[PDB]
Amino acid sequence: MQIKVNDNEFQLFVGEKRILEHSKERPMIYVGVGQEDVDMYRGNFKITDYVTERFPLKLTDVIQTADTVRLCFESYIIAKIKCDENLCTIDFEQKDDRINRFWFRVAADKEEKCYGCGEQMSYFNLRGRNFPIWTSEPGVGRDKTTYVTWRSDVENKAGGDYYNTNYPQPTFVSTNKYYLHVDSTAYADFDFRNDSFHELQIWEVPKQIRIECADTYLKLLERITTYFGRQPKLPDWVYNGLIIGVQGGNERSFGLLDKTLDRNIKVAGIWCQDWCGKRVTSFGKRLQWDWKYHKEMYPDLPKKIKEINAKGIKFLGYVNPYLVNDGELYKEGKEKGYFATKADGSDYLVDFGEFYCGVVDLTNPEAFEWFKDIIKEYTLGIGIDGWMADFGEYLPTDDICLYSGKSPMIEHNHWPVLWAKCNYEAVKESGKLGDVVYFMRAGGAGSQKYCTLLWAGDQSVDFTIHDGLASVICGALSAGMMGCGLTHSDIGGYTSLFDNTRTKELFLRWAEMAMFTPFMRTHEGNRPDTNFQYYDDEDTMERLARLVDVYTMLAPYTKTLVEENADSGHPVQRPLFMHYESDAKAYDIQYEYLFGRDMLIAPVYEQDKHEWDVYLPQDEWVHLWTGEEYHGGEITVSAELGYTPAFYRKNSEFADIFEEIREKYGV
Amino acid sequence: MQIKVNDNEFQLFVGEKRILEHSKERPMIYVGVGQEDVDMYRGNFKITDYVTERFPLKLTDVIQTADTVRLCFESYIIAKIKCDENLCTIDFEQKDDRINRFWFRVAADKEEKCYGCGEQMSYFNLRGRNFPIWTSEPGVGRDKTTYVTWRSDVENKAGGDYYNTNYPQPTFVSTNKYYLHVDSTAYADFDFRNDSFHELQIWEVPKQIRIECADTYLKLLERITTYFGRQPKLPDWVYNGLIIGVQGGNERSFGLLDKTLDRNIKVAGIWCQDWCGKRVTSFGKRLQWDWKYHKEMYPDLPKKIKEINAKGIKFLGYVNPYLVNDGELYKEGKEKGYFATKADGSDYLVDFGEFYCGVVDLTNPEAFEWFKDIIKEYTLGIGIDGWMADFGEYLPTDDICLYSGKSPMIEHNHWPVLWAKCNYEAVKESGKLGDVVYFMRAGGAGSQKYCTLLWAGDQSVDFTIHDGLASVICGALSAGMMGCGLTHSDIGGYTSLFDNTRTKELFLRWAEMAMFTPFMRTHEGNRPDTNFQYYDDEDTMERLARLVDVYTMLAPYTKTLVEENADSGHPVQRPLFMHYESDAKAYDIQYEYLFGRDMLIAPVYEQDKHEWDVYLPQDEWVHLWTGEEYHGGEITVSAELGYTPAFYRKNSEFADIFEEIREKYGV
Numbered sequence A, B: 001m002q003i004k005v006n007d008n009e010f011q012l013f014v015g016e017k018r019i020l021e022h023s024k025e026r027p028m029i030y031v032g033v034g035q036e037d038v039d040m041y042r043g044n045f046k047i048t049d050y051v052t053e054r055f056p057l058k059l060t061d062v063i064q065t066a067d068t069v070r071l072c073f074e075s076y077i078i079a080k081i082k083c084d085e086n087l088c089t090i091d092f093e094q095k096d097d098r099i100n101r102f103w104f105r106v107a108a109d110k111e112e113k114c115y116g117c118g119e120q121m122s123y124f125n126l127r128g129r130n131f132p133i134w135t136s137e138p139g140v141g142r143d144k145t146t147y148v149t150w151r152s153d154v155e156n157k158a159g160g161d162y163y164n165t166n167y168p169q170p171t172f173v174s175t176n177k178y179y180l181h182v183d184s185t186a187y188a189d190f191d192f193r194n195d196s197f198h199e200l201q202i203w204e205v206p207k208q209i210r211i212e213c214a215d216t217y218l219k220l221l222e223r224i225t226t227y228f229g230r231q232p233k234l235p236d237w238v239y240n241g242l243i244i245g246v247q248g249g250n251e252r253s254f255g256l257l258d259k260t261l262d263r264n265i266k267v268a269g270i271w272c273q274d275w276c277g278k279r280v281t282s283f284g285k286r287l288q289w290d291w292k293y294h295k296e297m298y299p300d301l302p303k304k305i306k307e308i309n310a311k312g313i314k315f316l317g318y319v320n321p322y323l324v325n326d327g328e329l330y331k332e333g334k335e336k337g338y339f340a341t342k343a344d345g346s347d348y349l350v351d352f353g354e355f356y357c358g359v360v361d362l363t364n365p366e367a368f369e370w371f372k373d374i375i376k377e378y379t380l381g382i383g384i385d386g387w388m389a390d391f392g393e394y395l396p397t398d399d400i401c402l403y404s405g406k407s408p409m410i411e412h413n414h415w416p417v418l419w420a421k422c423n424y425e426a427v428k429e430s431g432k433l434g435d436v437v438y439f440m441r442a443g444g445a446g447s448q449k450y451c452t453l454l455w456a457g458d459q460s461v462d463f464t465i466h467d468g469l470a471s472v473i474c475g476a477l478s479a480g481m482m483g484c485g486l487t488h489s490d491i492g493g494y495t496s497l498f499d500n501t502r503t504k505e506l507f508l509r510w511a512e513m514a515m516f517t518p519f520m521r522t523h524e525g526n527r528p529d530t531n532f533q534y535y536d537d538e539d540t541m542e543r544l545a546r547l548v549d550v551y552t553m554l555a556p557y558t559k560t561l562v563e564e565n566a567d568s569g570h571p572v573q574r575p576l577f578m579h580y581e582s583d584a585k586a587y588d589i590q591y592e593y594l595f596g597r598d599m600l601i602a603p604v605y606e607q608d609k610h611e612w613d614v615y616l617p618q619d620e621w622v623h624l625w626t627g628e629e630y631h632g633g634e635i636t637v638s639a640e641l642g643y644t645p646a647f648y649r650k651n652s653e654f655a656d657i658f659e660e661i662r663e664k665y666g667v
């Protein structure tokens, strides 16, 4: 990167491509004054802004030092710029206290594409749209043309839209082979609707903007994860097979484990989210938010965990950073003063849907340490080797006080990372990194270090584009470009509402994609009695045993991808353009991915399909199940139920593993 | 109205209430730069704006002469303020050509209420919401919680919202007893969401803002209509009875007339909107847009008109300012170059839903006179005595050129008044003002002069709040506060879509309201074959005979109201606070109206009702059907089908008429 600058024009280049400019004709910064309106309803946020001032700044002074270039903008902003061959930082100082709106422009051209802004569930390429950065419920349906979405809006204010996500991040990657990060947890809105610039709206003057370039996307990801962090290797035991999501107490849950094993489905672990109890609401069968094992539903659980461990099976649980008001840990947290409070001193109670919970104040070090100790003592301490570490999106912005003294308009997006750090430190302090794994749906900048595994959050139980099976693929790709290289999904989705229920076909198509991911896990969903469950159908269990076997057979390859993610930040699920940078079509494809360097996966995301159109970049490919060879381009392969459109490179060093799969399970 | 002004502060008072202020702490004007996006689909407009600059102006010079005060605002705006005891005008000169966004603030307090912004169908009191000023299709359903609205959005982009209207106007009335008008036909957005100020956003620097006060709302309406215009009296023949909306050609239409008369329903006129032919689309039974009578459907129509005239019955038709591209008049207009054109020089063909029409360029004086002559020759010239003068909302903004050379962003809202003027001059030059009547659903500033009669446009055929019977009352109250004092509605509504079809009860509830309006007219609606028609049911025809007879019995009173409207601008349908200005509840009521000074009407707007709650202001009231006396407050009256909740003042000079009605048709 190179800086060019006079007394009234600043420029920054990446190669021969200008990416920053401030002149009178093309200002780089606008500042202004806004008054927001934020209305939360059960984790959904309706956010509007009333802007009374917005104006571009005048560059009134420039000072060049061998290390720093200083831009003075009247009495509003000072920008200190420092550059290397690969890194520019722009630190901002605010000289006018009135400003609470900050618009930053990046030079662009019509053909450029951008990726990221966190885990995006609808659009991988961000160009042409804008993306608010505000963690929240991602929406049920997420598509205003569907009945599920409309009913979700009408009854629950919960239909959402294309940009909602549990894990937004003020960071993007450009096809000019740089990434840009705005060091701020404020509300932001990344606007890619203009041909000649990207505009980044921030609801504070951000501390710094960071820009870093590389010669390849692989190296760009190495630089991204150097700055944000890298995940550990997953525990070796995850590759033993399926992690089965079952509920109902000792007899039912361990009964289904035995039934699962008896049908020759390989099991890595049993995940009982109700290990701490159940709570039934009008949404469905939920959990008792009090993070100690439930002695009536799962008596003697520590002893029982030792027993299944001796048979090669791990036990997985569930925690989240809230506590319901009738729980034992709530009573203790109240007595110790560890909840976020209102101005009058009452503990703030959040409505999660017919029950009310305190928000453990993770910005209070004593409360943070207390909750970390709850994980150590009552989850890790009874031998639980993994858990869902849920939520993080529900911090309200109305009359709530945090120990940090910062506005909830700033701490709201910070919360997922504070929650991630709490889990990470519990595991690290216990010496269990690499032995236990928790998985999170919410995140922010820093989840690259503090989250051991993402999952895609709640999908609807359907084949829709914006909230079904397909949206998992988009979420994997976007998250991976942010440096979160390990993700998975609920096999079969989660959300059943408004006559939308899971089918056998949906479960199996979901499973045949999951076997080409690091972590296979099922989920009964919110209404288990009226949604298909794999253990309800012998044919499904037979079919599932094959899919899980394929996962275990892939594991020597998958371990090298997880290792490569841990070593350099190359995600396990990669976009096609990560290894085919010259292929123009690879930049527009978001429903196929490279499973490592050596496999291409194009999951079937529609019902009643028997063949599937696949775009293959130019290379020597072999269809997994048939061995037929392909050299690149649009094709159509058979894709019956159980036969994922999956291809491997001919000269892959793992071709023997893939051939063993074909011989055993091909056509 | 008194001005206070020094070098650093301007103020304007109405009595002892400050209505305008400019100081550095409370600026009166912001200016800026925006880039709109106007997405048009079949008369529906999705409009968004991208504001890049907005900033308050600094008052840098004040010049007082004897009559004028000149406020200079840097190099941006000069405002010339001239006041009287009742009138203040602010003329704006634009000194910076870059400005295309103008925000004008009006001082307000929390208890103030505001009325107007044209004909509003959802909210009469505007306080607490914002109202875009852009004529368009008003929406089907207009309520995001209903199935009809949702489907209208999904299939037709046509659900609309609370603010959409055929007739917006940048004019409001305040409870400080002033009205304010912005002299512009640009897009505007009147924002009443803030306690301490109204803010009027205009997408140009407006020529002038006009403010005029008065001691009473009656006198305010006198001033409003002195400025905007007053309607003529309605022709005496309208009071002869019902205007029946029928279709199908000579045999069916005049057959239905005979049937109606045979059932002893008094008929003032037969309104055949298909006088010029039909066109069937997926929307339903529409019309052929070629404004000459259809010689195959209505052979020898001029002869038929003479025959029914000799029996005391008028004939009414239909025109609108567009021409379908397979018609005779389209061919002539195309030859003479009388259509609006695109940038590429071709005639712009607007899609109205499976057919395409030219827009007669009403800004071209030659085309204007031509279309006026079309009305004289082919409507008035064959003896038609009234007509629906429809549409006016569909001018596109994307790629169109007008003879005026003004932007379609300015002429779009202008079109309804140009079209009104076309009809007005045809009638006036024919010497028929007061003898023939046309009715319009679209309008703008000036419709007060150029439109002889409003109607509330298309309602859905239901009892919903935002698009059924009740929204007619809101439209009547709001239009009347703007000086359009004559209005009516389709008895039974118009729009049938998405499993919503007209019922008998709905038709009858609508008719029993309509008999307390100036003009009773039915309509077959868009899907006559699958919707209730009054002539389907003998009991309905017997009931309608009574309702129409009541309308004729009221005529001596109603005529004095229409004459009062023509002489002073007091609307026929008045808000309760127009005659009870001290009644606090009168300012919150929008589904009751005073029918002149001597009657209160509170229509049943819900199904399955046998009684109705009514608020009466403090006065001596007599329930029309029973004779029971009431003295003010909340009451409940019997309100069976046919017994509108209607009350008259005991001391009314017309009490003898009202007693005859009770004797003949009461309980």
Ligand SMILES: O=S(=O)(O)C[C@H]1CNC[C@@H](O)[C@@H]1O
Pocket (backbone or CB within 6 Å): A273, A285, A286, A287, A288, A390, A458, A494, A523
């Ligand atoms: O119902 S609960 O809220 O207790 C648990 C759910 C929370 N969201 C993620 C889902 O996977 C959990 O089952």
Ligand SMILES: O=S(=O)(O)C[C@H]1CNC[C@@H](O)[C@@H]1O
Pocket (backbone or CB within 6 Å): B273, B285, B286, B287, B288, B390, B458, B494, B525
């Ligand atoms: O269907 S048509 O468009 O020809 C006529 C309708 C237009 N809008 C107003 C309605 O009253 C008409 O029937």
